[PDB]
Amino acid sequence: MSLISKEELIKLAYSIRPRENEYKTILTNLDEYNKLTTNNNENKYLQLKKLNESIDVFMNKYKTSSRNRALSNLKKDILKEVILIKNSNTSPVEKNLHFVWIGGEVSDIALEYIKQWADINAEYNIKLWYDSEAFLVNTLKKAIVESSTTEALQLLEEEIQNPQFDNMKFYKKRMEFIYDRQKRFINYYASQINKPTVPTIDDIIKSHLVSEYNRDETVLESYRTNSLRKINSNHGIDIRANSLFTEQELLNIYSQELLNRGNLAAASDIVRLLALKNFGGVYLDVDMLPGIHSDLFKTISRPSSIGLDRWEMIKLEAIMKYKKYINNYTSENFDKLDQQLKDNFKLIIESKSEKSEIFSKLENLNVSDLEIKIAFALGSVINQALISKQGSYLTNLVIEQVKNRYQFLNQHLNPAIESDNNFTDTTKIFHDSLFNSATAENSMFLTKIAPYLQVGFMPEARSTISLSGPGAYASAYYDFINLQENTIEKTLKASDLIEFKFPENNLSQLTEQEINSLWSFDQASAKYQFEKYVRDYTGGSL
Amino acid sequence: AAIRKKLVIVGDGACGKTCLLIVFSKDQFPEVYVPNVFENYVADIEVDGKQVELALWDTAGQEDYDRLRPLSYPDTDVILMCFSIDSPDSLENIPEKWTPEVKHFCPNVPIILVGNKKDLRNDEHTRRELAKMKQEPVKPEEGRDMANRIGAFGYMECSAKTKDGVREVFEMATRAALQ
Ligand SMILES: O=c1ccn([C@@H]2O[C@H](COP(=O)(O)OP(=O)(O)O[C@H]3O[C@H](CO)[C@@H](O)[C@H](O)[C@H]3O)[C@@H](O)[C@H]2O)c(=O)[nH]1
Ligand SMILES: Nc1nc2c(ncn2[C@@H]2O[C@H](COP(=O)(O)OP(=O)(O)O)[C@@H](O)[C@H]2O)c(=O)[nH]1
Ligand SMILES: [Mg+2]
Ligand SMILES: [Mn+2]
């Protein structure tokens, strides 16, 4: 079905005044929508958006118009019409499972997590996306952070021994070296990248590590070829050979995260979007596990002691302890419970003969060609699991949110970076730029992106969320619901958001690997890490 | 409909602002970890016959964000000034850092003094490791006295883990915003 007819709106919006040109446009757009016989949902949505924009133009020019009454009601209709198109006709997603591991050799833990998915869903293609030119990025990051750690320890030699030493002073001091070294690498890269014998990222990294960090070339090449071999044997697919990057702007974003910042999670954020766009299907983080059978442990009642989150962890720990589907999976929390429950579990688990009787199959995940589903945690969105049809409008919206936020970040950050000051002074200039550009529309965003340079190297630096992560997804959701673009801080109500939830029964998020982020850490981990640094620095090594 | 009101939470780092916001907004306390989700806190509440939508703004209490905190302050309707019961140092900073900053940036905005982590006042480990630094947990009279000294609208204790007093905290903040 469609909206109200052209003549119906004329009727409903009758005035003494003659028809203003904006109103003629409104009627034309509404008609064109009604007369539209296109089975393409994107075309329908775009026509609706055009209509909505025309209405807005009218209601903003003639704010006192008597037509505003009806033009407001039609707007309420248009929203209802959006959902109507989304919910009406769904098909299953392309049966692709997308994973990303970039920057080095994929570990066996990740492979085992992927193995679970692939075993349960033998009909789905597994795509482990990697960058064939960037196997040494993690090595370079490791080298930079270790050099910086030693430099900061030696600097505060006289102080780190004091038990009342603030660890933040260590991390702040180290950041200065980290930034210096990042600049040095980037300047070298920028000089090397334009040689006639067009060098790869790995070539430049190798050269830089050999020159500046006393690394062995042969060892580095060995590691690189090993990484390539290992990933190619486990569903590996190269982003550089499948043309995921058509826009230079997206490649620039990806590269700035992969090279300038050494944030592999941010690079992953870009790649997953491009993959879901070009191919479609399901994206999963390497710390995500398939959903547990919906009522496999309903015979076992949760004790009053343990909360829900931990309860679920124990479930996983139990499964891994009696099935050994994944090597070296923890049992810490599972060990801390009485044999009454412990034994009970074992019976239920070992009773089942097939893996399918423990974990859930994805089978057909029915979605609309407009939408993208996202995982939920703490009643908010998180892009660790995604479902999207190829060329979905919403995915393109998210990609647009990312480009937009990177445009604003780079515009405000580039002058400071280029000033070639130390970390503090560059931060000062960047913050000044942010401060100067502050409005009541974007202030919360500026607060979030403020420690962008510190992400990965200092605790509580989680800017990635507001650039390439969940923040962009939430804004794109709001963008879509209200037929908008480039929304910054507007958010939806829960009822409107649950519409895009990743089915709970098809995902296990409380895995051992998830609780330890690979791109950020908190202050407690920073404290523990600093104490370990001091212990190992003072004790010596053999 | 509903009345829109802005709440901003301030206080020392680690005193439990984030967990409190999450507990109130989503009725969930993170027992294990805090996932890297999109941070947005909005809550509907009915107080004194009215229905109010509270926009909860979190802040970083650390000095690193001293110069950025003020971007969150404009158009604030109510401030939750927080301290942790298990951190006397946290309470001592209320009038050293937070009161002048809140006065300078949010003139005439009511302040609710919130003493967080109520469940640690009687905790054994807490008392033990506080005795080493020759300290003891904060008494309610200590907090009440501080509310009167700073001219706060009210004082309330809560425990985000047990959800004890959380509703009362936000209800009191709402009453302060409506006044
Ligand atoms: O060296 C690395 C490190 C990370 N990754 C990728 O980035 C992921 C991030 O996973 P994780 O370390 O668990 O990040 P989270 O802490 O779980 O953060 C969540 O919120 C962030 C907001 O951007 C996202 O980027 C994450 O995808 C999202 O799951 C991994 O799955 C990989 O895909 C790599 O490819 N190479
Ligand atoms: N015992 C107890 N611990 C808490 C409570 N609220 C928070 N915590 C812990 O204190 C830490 C700091 O909490 P957070 O909300 O991040 O404080 P913030 O630094 O002000 O954002 C968290 O890791 C919590 O586990 C509480 O009510 N009781
Ligand atoms: Mg916090
Ligand atoms: Mn994760």
Author numbering:
A (entry chain A): 1 to 542
B (entry chain B): 2 to 180
Provide passages from the article that reported this PDB entry.
As key virulence factors of C. difficile, toxin A (TcdA) and toxin B (TcdB) act by glucosylating and inactivating Rho and Ras family small GTPases in host cells, which leads to actin cytoskeleton disruption, cell rounding, and ultimately cell death. TcdA and TcdB have modular architectures consisting of four major domains: an N-terminal glucosyltransferase domain (GTD), a cysteine protease domain (CPD), a delivery and receptor binding domain (DRBD), and a combined repetitive oligopeptides (CROPs) domain. TcdA, TcdB, and other members in the LCGT family glucosylate Rho and/or Ras GTPases at the highly conserved threonine residue (for example T35 in Rac1 and Cdc42, T37 in RhoA) using uridine diphosphate-glucose (UDP-glucose) as the sugar donor. Glucosylation prevents these GTPases from binding to their downstream effector proteins and therefore abolish their functions in many crucial signaling pathways related to morphogenesis, polarity, movement, and cell division.
Here we report the co-crystal structure of GTDTcdA from strain VPI10463 in complex with human RhoA in the presence of UDP-glucose, GDP, Mn2+ and Mg2+. In this study, we used the same strategy to design a tandem RhoA (residues 1–181)–GTDTcdA (residues 1–542, strain VPI10463) fusion protein, where the two proteins are linked via an 18-amino acid peptide linker (GGGGSGGGSGTGSGGGGS). RhoA carries the T37N mutation to prevent glucosylation. We also introduced a K190A mutation on GTDTcdA to minimize non-specific degradation at this site during protein expression and purification. The best crystals of the GTDTcdA–RhoA complex were obtained in the presence of Mn2+ and UDP-glucose that bind to the GTD and Mg2+ and GDP that bind to RhoA, and the structure was determined at 2.60 Å resolution. The co-factors, Mn2+, Mg2+, GDP, and the UDP moiety of UDP-glucose, have well-defined electron densities, but the glucosyl moiety of UDP-glucose has weaker density that is likely due to partial cleavage of UDP-glucose during crystallization. Here we present the co-crystal structure of the glucosyltransferase domain (GTD) of TcdA in complex with its substrate human RhoA at 2.60-angstrom resolution. This structure reveals that TcdA GTD grips RhoA mainly through its switch I and switch II regions, which is complemented by interactions involving RhoA’s pre-switch I region. In the GTDTcdA–RhoA complex, the RhoA switch I is stabilized by extensive hydrophobic packing involving residues V33, Y34, V35, P36, V38 and F39 of RhoA and residues M313, A377, L378, V381, I382, I465, P470, A474, L510 and I515 of GTDTcdA, suggesting that this new conformation of the switch I is induced by the GTD. Triggered by the GTD, such a movement of the switch I positions N37 of RhoA, corresponding to the glucosylation target T37 in the wild type RhoA, into the UDP-glucose binding pocket of the GTD, where N37 interacts with residues R462, S517 and S520 of GTDTcdA and UDP-glucose via hydrogen bonds.
